[PDB]
Design a protein around this ligand. Structure first.
Ligand SMILES: *[C@@H]1O[C@H](CO)[C@@H](O[C@@H]2O[C@H](CO)[C@@H](O[C@@H]3O[C@H](CO[C@H]4O[C@H](CO[C@H]5O[C@H](CO)[C@@H](O)[C@H](O)[C@@H]5O)[C@@H](O)[C@H](O[C@H]5O[C@H](CO)[C@@H](O)[C@H](O)[C@@H]5O)[C@@H]4O)[C@@H](O)[C@H](O[C@H]4O[C@H](CO)[C@@H](O)[C@H](O)[C@@H]4O[C@H]4O[C@H](CO)[C@@H](O)[C@H](O)[C@@H]4O[C@H]4O[C@H](CO)[C@@H](O)[C@H](O)[C@@H]4O)[C@@H]3O)[C@H](O)[C@H]2NC(C)=O)[C@H](O)[C@H]1NC(C)=O
Ligand SMILES: *[C@@H]1O[C@H](CO)[C@@H](O[C@@H]2O[C@H](CO)[C@@H](O[C@@H]3O[C@H](CO[C@H]4O[C@H](CO[C@H]5O[C@H](CO)[C@@H](O)[C@H](O)[C@@H]5O)[C@@H](O)[C@H](O[C@H]5O[C@H](CO)[C@@H](O)[C@H](O)[C@@H]5O)[C@@H]4O)[C@@H](O)[C@H](O[C@H]4O[C@H](CO)[C@@H](O)[C@H](O)[C@@H]4O[C@H]4O[C@H](CO)[C@@H](O)[C@H](O)[C@@H]4O[C@H]4O[C@H](CO)[C@@H](O)[C@H](O)[C@@H]4O)[C@@H]3O)[C@H](O)[C@H]2NC(C)=O)[C@H](O)[C@H]1NC(C)=O
Ligand SMILES: *[C@@H]1O[C@H](CO)[C@@H](O[C@@H]2O[C@H](CO)[C@@H](O[C@@H]3O[C@H](CO[C@H]4O[C@H](CO[C@H]5O[C@H](CO)[C@@H](O)[C@H](O)[C@@H]5O)[C@@H](O)[C@H](O[C@H]5O[C@H](CO)[C@@H](O)[C@H](O)[C@@H]5O)[C@@H]4O)[C@@H](O)[C@H](O[C@H]4O[C@H](CO)[C@@H](O)[C@H](O)[C@@H]4O[C@H]4O[C@H](CO)[C@@H](O)[C@H](O)[C@@H]4O[C@H]4O[C@H](CO)[C@@H](O)[C@H](O)[C@@H]4O)[C@@H]3O)[C@H](O)[C@H]2NC(C)=O)[C@H](O)[C@H]1NC(C)=O
Ligand SMILES: *[C@@H]1O[C@H](CO)[C@@H](O[C@@H]2O[C@H](CO)[C@@H](O[C@@H]3O[C@H](CO[C@H]4O[C@H](CO[C@H]5O[C@H](CO)[C@@H](O)[C@H](O)[C@@H]5O)[C@@H](O)[C@H](O[C@H]5O[C@H](CO)[C@@H](O)[C@H](O)[C@@H]5O)[C@@H]4O)[C@@H](O)[C@H](O[C@H]4O[C@H](CO)[C@@H](O)[C@H](O)[C@@H]4O[C@H]4O[C@H](CO)[C@@H](O)[C@H](O)[C@@H]4O[C@H]4O[C@H](CO)[C@@H](O)[C@H](O)[C@@H]4O)[C@@H]3O)[C@H](O)[C@H]2NC(C)=O)[C@H](O)[C@H]1NC(C)=O
Ligand SMILES: *[C@@H]1O[C@H](CO)[C@@H](O[C@@H]2O[C@H](CO)[C@@H](O)[C@H](O)[C@H]2NC(C)=O)[C@H](O)[C@H]1NC(C)=O
Ligand SMILES: *[C@@H]1O[C@H](CO)[C@@H](O[C@@H]2O[C@H](CO)[C@@H](O)[C@H](O)[C@H]2NC(C)=O)[C@H](O)[C@H]1NC(C)=O
Ligand SMILES: [Ca+2]
Ligand SMILES: [Ca+2]
Ligand SMILES: [Ca+2]
Ligand SMILES: [Ca+2]
Ligand SMILES: [Ca+2]
Lengths: 389, 389, 389, 389
């Protein structure tokens, strides 16, 4: 009955962003049984789109919320839940157990991947059709880790980018090509990106583009472009001087295409872009110093043009509100002739920026592109920290 | 498999109203995780009827309920939930994000529309089959806004009435004709209605009738009648001297067919009527001054007869209980030979009438017509405000 | 696809009773969002069996639980929920609004009936396939009321017994014959039963037997036997001197077949029996004075033999625990060659017997027959009232 | 459409264990409506795998949690719920009522068995396709009891092991062979096992292997091997000197194949093994004295070789964390050419080891085998008891 999805369409023209989903999880969880989360994303099946994140295995009001700034424990799991509801104890479906994930539907069924273990002995389990199929042991014994947003499939082949090794020098990044949860091939990273974490990917016209985080050196973002038929890839950086990691230095006039733009070391944030010629939009935090604010900038030819500057933009979160990770997804099963770019922003609340509470959590806002030039609003998390004291 | 619904039936004869649904949301939410709402309605799919409303993105007992008198924020969404259950965190399905909505099923799938943004830069997103399809930017830069109750479709064409512009003088009302979430046509309001907000619509014999709110001048209600095949409409007022907005002056002996009946300016409430010759019933608040009580009056030829008075009635909510918005819907997929008129009343609790609590919310009661002459009960919200202090 | 169910089987031989379902609702609702209920029952669809009851439109821990001894309000509804779960805010499906009900599946879909209104102006609404179809106005203007347990259908015809009029003298009982929610016929009660309330019915070999409550005079129970093909009935009393209403006098040696067995006036409890020759079992409270304890007694030929005494029995609830209403149901869609008799007991907690709390609620236990002679346990509600203070 | 499952595959090669599911129930239930449980397990249907356990009919934070160390009451039920969610009031489906259970899917539908009653008069009810079909009365009048983990079917025949009689001397164990919930045959235990409780079973190549608990004498575990076609069985003990009950004496150099290995009397814990030649893995608690820690040991030929020692292992729960019962299950409906061994560990919290709280409950962790040699983590319950004081 169902066939594997093929990436046959190009991106729709992005003239602005419209609201798609928002869960208000922190506001609602002040007085309801909402799980503490972080590292959220969005992903569609052929008949539904859902929110996803890594639970911390406690509610926000629960006493076990104390300590949830920590990224890795035995109490995390990848959960999904209905679009724009909050992640509650009673509506959250566990996809797999662990503290680093990705997930994508191939048109027939869903693959989900969760990594668990101690830092020196982690392993991935690849689930397909809600059953475990393949396992991969750590190859560098230092926090095996993956995208924290959806993967993308083409004719059953779903590439996934993993890293294992240091966060503050060269590491061992691998691109795995899965089909029905089995490994067809893997390759080591090639090209000019010097460090890769937390790739945010999308597909169009039989090519998958991933915008990642160079935690080690780069305040420009590395880009991996994957051919899922040939099962090959390239890597470079976004050439534009509109720098989109965080923290970062101020924007220069000329960026770097094949090396990290320097100025900030050993830090970053997961983020994304859509790189499609003149139809190119970059997300970034507004602040250069912290995970505050969020904006989209139209930067024609950002990938290839080392002097490209914005020609249009849209504020998503004011710089007086907290943001966080951000990532790409699309509804590959929508009607019409083109794929509509979407993204989400994780709105982090609690530690370390708001340390009067003992927890860290987030809510989600997400937007998709419009071919209209729509008015803009800002979309904060909306919770009052003082209510939790 | 499924075909678009056609409005092939006339209304059943309304000889009284029977109880259809009631959620007791405020009573139950005193000690359960019920979302704060307002602007509720009811709408049917071919296999289920559901309650809908605009959440405020907090529970009633939650500390974020403080401030929920306010109509527009980034934390509102259109939600639906099973008939007569309350809107809870765990059972409420988000249809779209925003602070003004409508929704209707065309026989194949559902269209939902939500407007969001700041007052001077709002936009509608039209969702079809649970995906975003079309967007419309504000045309007058002043609170783009729509029905707050269900739309109606005929052979796939679902007209929707929007207003943008002042609430206290001429505004720019448009009737959009959607099919599969795409715009076939729109037209500016024509006819003699001088201001339109919050239309309540129903269909019968290939005609859609909408009873709306003239916020600017009129205490009689404007009526828009739409031909969804020709995609044309007319407008006038209910001619009857039984005035049905709120607040309003006392009832005269002769009303106005083609102009606002004066006496109250710059206010109103969403309401409804069924206008079908001798089979005409009007809803209204009992109080002329405030949103208290609710009654149905049988007013033969109310639309056309400027001296028409009641010949029968039914009390729905006593004048010592709070009411609120009211609106029309029908189950277009029921058995039998005629469409059974239904309506709901929003029972508003909290601010501004009950200001010992810091929140505003509501529950729902809803009734449908019977061809019997049934005994009447009154149907209050039923919550005790003192329990929330 | 689906056909109407026919009553083609006889009862299985009842040699003891096994546990079927129990919800522990009061225990669990001490610290979860469980609705206050009373007047529960059980009813099966072709693919699932569910618990049903009349909600009071509040949780047990909620402040609106104060006052829930009262039987009739605008905040009651017939709800159903999964077998042996408790009736919670989040899992309870409302079937219809009102304070007296019955419900049954005909093999194609379900009919549910709810009565609402003030005592002098009540009305029934008959829902079929989850939509309202027919309405019936009060005929005697004194608490129109029905079974409070499931009805039974045969080839689409579902008879239902209603009463309207005094509870303490002659009233007007009617048997309605519904098909697809429409009235085929009704008849006034005939035969020798002198007053009827709250009938508990079951079907076998194309005959429906209902055991009811004579509130006015009788401590023996009236029995109505209905032919759903001819749409006729008879009535009499259980002849046995094993008296099964409550309160009641002590058991005599000879009962009454065609008149109320006297000794207690103007009170009773809903109850049931299976009347099948030697395979006859009667339920009753153990106490003659109050709704405490519950037992089944095998009383061969109880219906017809005015000296019949027990030959076997089973204790269901000890006389040191509270009971309440009880009623019959069967799974008419089970495998095998005979219908397995089942029943439920309502375990009432709170007022008036336990008046340190301000509420009245209940839980459910239910049993079905076995052809084995099984060991017996007792099945109390299990909640500690002191925990609610 | 569906056919009965046949055990046509052998076990996959077990080279390590990967995380499969974990519910964090005690952590989450500190501030959400999680039921108190014990005696959990896991079982798959053709389209889903679920967690199961015996509820205690109260939440953990509820006042009725006081006293839940006790094993048998009228308020217990077998519940199931989605894999890795916690067992909550709102998501837990009751399978049947009682205080000892087993359940398995035959490829067409599920059989569930629950035993209830007082110790001297207990009875099993066998449910098939969610309806009661057969009942079995106590044969020895002393705590009729069964596996507390899943049964296994082959071509519709689902053997189940029961015991009735003393826990501290010879008892009466029976193997029942069910098909469609009916009894085809039963046999008394034969072979050399001298006492049997709480068998943990799995199937491969048309043979079912059960590893049980000799509560009376043995610190080695008894093994029952069942031929579900011939409906015959054998019994012996695991010959290995790697002793796997608890409490137990220290490991000797030579075990016992046909008699209990002595040293500890009248106690034990439910546990499991996979016995497949060199592909043999045994679970056990790390502590010899208490239910603390959990490890898997690869013990080639453990069943048959009375000097077999470990050649590989994996720690599952550190010896500074509490464990509990453990049991086997597999997904018999997975893809591929072999059945992947899985197990669960019950992580008991509260009494008697943690007696500052008044309750006993547990959470679940579960693992399945990998053909990789994966890094290991430990998987504690994760709750802080002090938060519950
Ligand atoms: C109702 O809603 C609508 C729809 O949302 C609202 O309209 C939106 O309004 C916003 C806000 O104004 C606009 O976003 C900004 O867009 C500009 C880009 O547009 C300007 O530039 C265009 C390019 O000009 C150049 O090239 C063209 C050739 O292609 C040439 O023609 C031109 O002369 C010049 O050489 C112009 O084309 C464009 O004009 C067009 O549009 C105008 C409407 O906007 C119209 O008036 C014109 O007639 C014409 O049609 C326009 O001039 C972005 O540049 C801008 O983003 C910068 O600024 C914000 C702060 O506001 C900052 O956060 C951004 O990061 C970015 O600035 C940083 O980075 C730059 C790049 O390196 C750097 O140069 C800056 O110094 C700055 O860097 C500093 O901050 C960063 C961030 O913290 C830090 O990292 C650095 O280190 C450093 O510290 C905004 O995105 C929307 O485009 C506009 N949308 C639409 C459709 O109109 C409307 O306002 C609402 N109505 C109401 C009443 O509220
Ligand atoms: C069990 O349940 C049943 C079923 O519900 C209960 O029966 C229901 O009882 C109620 C309450 O009585 C009825 O509702 C009222 O209905 C009347 C209309 O019916 C009267 O008028 C009919 C028309 O008479 C005129 O025309 C005919 C020709 O067509 C001519 O024949 C006649 O002589 C005259 O010229 C009569 O036909 C009708 O008689 C029939 O029915 C009688 C039963 O009701 C029966 O006894 C008769 O034999 C005959 O069969 C009857 O006389 C509505 O007028 C009325 O609503 C007005 O009053 C309420 C206050 O009660 C008010 O809230 C309404 O807004 C409305 O009055 C306001 O507006 C008017 C219009 O502008 C204005 O004129 C009024 O001054 C008033 O205005 C003021 O208040 C408003 C609102 O606050 C404010 O805006 C203004 O500014 C101003 O301040 C009720 O709807 C049901 O129809 C009736 N149903 C049935 C089927 O019987 C039964 O009672 C229950 N039993 C028990 C024991 O409780
Ligand atoms: C493990 O579980 C098993 C299975 O559950 C347990 O076994 C069950 O045990 C219970 C309790 O004993 C039994 O229930 C009682 O059953 C008797 C009926 O059986 C007796 O009578 C039979 C009829 O005898 C007469 O007729 C036959 C001819 O048909 C003739 O042969 C005979 O001589 C005589 O003329 C006997 O056949 C039967 O014997 C058989 O079974 C015996 C086992 O029980 C066995 O030992 C024998 O060999 C033989 O095989 C037996 O003698 C019911 O009468 C009884 O119910 C009455 O008593 C209870 C109080 O205990 C009361 O609550 C009931 O309401 C009822 O008594 C009231 O009503 C009567 C009727 O009007 C009245 O006469 C009484 O005075 C009394 O009235 C007072 O109280 C009521 C209520 O408050 C009030 O309204 C009145 O006004 C008044 O104040 C019990 O139901 C089960 O049948 C039995 N089941 C099985 C399969 O064995 C086993 O015990 C458990 N094991 C353990 C270790 O716990
Ligand atoms: C990243 O993750 C990986 C993967 O998990 C981690 O690697 C795992 O590391 C663990 C911990 O070391 C290993 O588990 C232990 O495995 C050993 C078995 O392996 C040893 O023995 C093998 C057999 O040797 C004998 O036979 C062979 C012939 O077949 C012969 O060649 C040999 O000379 C000898 O005669 C060796 O083959 C094996 O070597 C191989 O593997 C090595 C890696 O482990 C490698 O270095 C070698 O080159 C070679 O490749 C190895 O030597 C188990 O014996 C052991 O379990 C015992 O000990 C633990 C305590 O640690 C205890 O809890 C167990 O119960 C058990 O000991 C009890 O029972 C025994 C049996 O009766 C008894 O003899 C003991 O005295 C003891 O009894 C006491 O305690 C019990 C329990 O409380 C009580 O009941 C008794 O009464 C008494 O008080 C562990 O299971 C994994 O196998 C290994 N996995 C893999 C794939 O490598 C890696 O460490 C992680 N990395 C980091 C950085 O953390
Ligand atoms: C995606 O492209 C693949 C490759 O062309 C399509 O695969 C074919 O699908 C049909 C079944 O629908 C098979 O009978 C062919 O044998 C397949 N060919 C190959 C080369 O695998 C697939 O159908 C396309 N997906 C969609 C949604 O059309
Ligand atoms: C119950 O009995 C009725 C009456 O005999 C059966 O009704 C017939 O059903 C078939 C469809 O399955 C029709 O084509 C006939 O016309 C029906 N006859 C009548 C007289 O109504 C019904 O099928 C029986 N129900 C079951 C479950 O067999
Ligand atoms: Ca960086
Ligand atoms: Ca007005
Ligand atoms: Ca709560
Ligand atoms: Ca009586
Ligand atoms: Ca033992």
């Amino acid at each position: 009955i169902r066939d594997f999805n093929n990436l046959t369409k190009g991106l729709c023209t992005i003239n602005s962003w419209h609201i798609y989903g928002k869960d208000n999880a922190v506001r609602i969880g002040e007085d309801s049984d909402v799980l503490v989360t972080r590292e959220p994303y969005v992903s569609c099946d052929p008949d539904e789109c859902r929110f996803y994140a890594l639970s911390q295995g406690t509610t926000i009001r629960g006493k076990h919320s104390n300590g949830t700034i920590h990224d890795r424990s035995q109490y995390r799991a990848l959960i999904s839940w209905p679009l724009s509801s909050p992640p509650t104890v009673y509506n959250s479906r566990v996809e797999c157990i662990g503290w680093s994930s990705t997930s994508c539907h191939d048109g027939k069924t869903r693959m989900s991947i969760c990594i668990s273990g101690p830092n020196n002995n982690a392993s991935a389990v690849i689930w397909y059709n809600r059953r475990p199929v393949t396992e991969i042991n750590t190859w560098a014994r230092n926090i095996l880790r993956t995208q924290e947003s959806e993967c993308v499939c083409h004719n059953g082949v779903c590439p996934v980018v993993f890293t294992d090794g240091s966060a503050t020098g060269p590491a061992e990044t691998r691109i795995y090509y899965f089909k029905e949860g089995k490994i067809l091939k893997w390759e080591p990273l090639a090209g000019t990106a010097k460090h890769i974490e937390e790739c945010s990917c999308y597909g169009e016209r039989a090519e998958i583009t991933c915008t990642c985080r160079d935690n080690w050196q780069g305040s420009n973002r590395p880009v991996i472009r994957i051919d899922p038929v040939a099962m090959t890839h390239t890597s470079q950086y976004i050439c534009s001087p509109v720098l989109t990691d965080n923290p970062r230095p101020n924007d220069p006039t000329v960026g770097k295409c094949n090396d990290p733009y320097p100025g900030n070391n050993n830090n970053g944030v997961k983020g994304f872009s859509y790189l499609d010629g003149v139809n190119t939009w970059l997300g970034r935090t507004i602040s250069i110093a912290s995970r505050s604010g969020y904006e989209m900038l139209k930067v024609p030819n950002a990938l290839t043009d080392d002097k490209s500057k914005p020609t249009q933009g849209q504020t998503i979160v004011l710089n007086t509100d907290w943001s966080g990770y951000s990532g790409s997804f699309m509804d590959y099963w929508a009607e019409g002739e083109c794929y509509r770019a979407c993204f989400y922003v994780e709105l982090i609340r609690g530690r370390p920026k708001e340390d009067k509470v003992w927890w860290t959590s987030n809510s989600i806002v997400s937007m998709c592109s419009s071919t209209e030039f729509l008015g803009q609003w800002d979309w904060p998390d909306g919770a009052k920290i003082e209510y939790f004291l």
